[PDB]
Ligand binder design. Structure first.
Ligand SMILES: COc1ccc(C2=NN(C(C)C)C(=O)[C@@H]3CC=CC[C@H]23)cc1C#CC(=O)NCc1ccccc1
Ligand SMILES: [Mg+2]
Ligand SMILES: [Zn+2]
Length: 333
């Protein structure tokens, strides 16, 4: 990868984020993006401020400059797709910050693990092309073939991990360069385990494992820490419905458009299109979100809060009010 230039860094350091509290659960990244003519710089600046403000990079020998380099190397590898772009991973970073510090999940982890989570948020979807794992397998795409051949069906997640390892292999962008021995190993393994755990095919088993570990007073500590990390990246990854309703809605619009574009390409390639990917089925956003809330997000957040993350109660509350607002959209249609 080409080194980050001084001009690239300055363009981020310029951004001042006047009127924004990046630590707030009601922070609005869409408003931040609209605020400016250079949304990519503002997004980078948000990530930068979150990481420096945590106090964590400083404690792990990561310089302000290596941090900004890392952020900009991550940025270069996100594509202009509707949802799985740089704004999503910055959003996940910001959201995880809130979970750690507003939800007090930081209490469950070491400072290094908190640092790893914030960093992992920015790598966890590198070079996403707007197509899910299933597309690559169904179309016998080269990436799909390689996954099947090598025995790992987490097509995209292994790819993300590959590119994270590349970025971090250069000291100029290695936010873990200040680490050695077992700390450096834990950083890489936990980062990778977390990204691998974002494959929604593993959702049920990841959740089950965490819940079982959390219920067990005699769980292995290292294992509980690792599963807590996995659950928090997962939580951030499906956190759109925990946001204030107009933020939540904009996310649903973007993901819906990404799905529809995949559906279009599936049609052209003559492979199976699921209803939720099909523009012609014309399905209402309100029912989409309610279904996601009922079948995925509300059980997830409720169970982890009840089991262990009591401080993240507000996520359950916002999901509940978001569901009620979508139901009011139905009621008045
Ligand atoms: C902002 O809403 C969303 C935010 C995220 C996702 C994601 N879905 N999945 C899986 C669950 C299909 C992924 O694997 C994506 C990649 C990794 C993590 C989560 C991602 C879906 C929606 C939605 C919706 C929506 O209205 N459809 C209706 C729906 C109903 C039931 C279940 C899923 C969708
Ligand atoms: Mg992903
Ligand atoms: Zn993601």
């Amino acid at each position: 990868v080409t080194a980050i230039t001084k001009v690239e860094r300055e363009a981020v350091l310029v951004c001042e984020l006047p009127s924004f509290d990046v630590t707030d659960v009601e922070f609005d990244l869409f408003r931040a993006r609209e605020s400016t003519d250079k949304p990519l710089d503002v997004a980078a600046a948000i990530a930068y401020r979150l990481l420096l403000g945590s106090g964590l990079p400083q404690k792990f020998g990561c310089s302000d400059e290596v941090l900004l380099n890392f952020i900009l190397q991550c940025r270069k590898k996100y594509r202009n797709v509707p949802y799985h772009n740089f704004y999503h991973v910055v959003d996940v970073c910001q959201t995880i910050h809130t979970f750690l510090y507003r939800g007090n999940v930081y209490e469950k982890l070491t400072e290094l693990e908190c640092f790893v989570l914030l960093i992992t948020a920015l790598v966890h979807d590198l070079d996403h092309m707007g197509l899910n794992n299933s597309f690559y397998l169904k179309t016998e795409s080269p990436l799909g073939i390689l996954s099947s051949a090598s025995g790992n069906t987490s097509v995209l997640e292994v790819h993300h991990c590959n590119l994270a390892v590349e970025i971090l292999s250069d000291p100029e962008s290695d936010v873990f360069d200040g680490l050695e021995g077992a700390e450096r190993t834990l950083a890489f393994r936990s980062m990778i385990d977390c990204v691998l755990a974002t494959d929604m095919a593993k959702h049920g088993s990841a959740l089950e494992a965490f819940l079982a570990s959390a219920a067990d007073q005699s769980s292995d500590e290292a294992a509980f820490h690792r599963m807590t990390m996995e659950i928090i990246l997962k939580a951030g990854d499906i956190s759109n419905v925990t946001k204030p309703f107009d933020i939540s809605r904009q996310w649903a619009m973007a993901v819906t458009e990404e799905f529809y574009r995949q559906g279009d390409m599936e049609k052209e390639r003559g492979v199976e299109v699921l209803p939720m990917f099909d523009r012609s089925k014309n399905m209402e956003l309100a029912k989409g979100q309610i279904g996601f809330i009922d079948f995925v997000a509300a059980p997830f957040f409720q169970k982890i809060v009840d089991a262990c993350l009591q401080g993240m109660q507000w996520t359950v509350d916002r999901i509940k009010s978001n569901r009620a607002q979508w139901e009011r959209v139905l009621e008045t249609r």
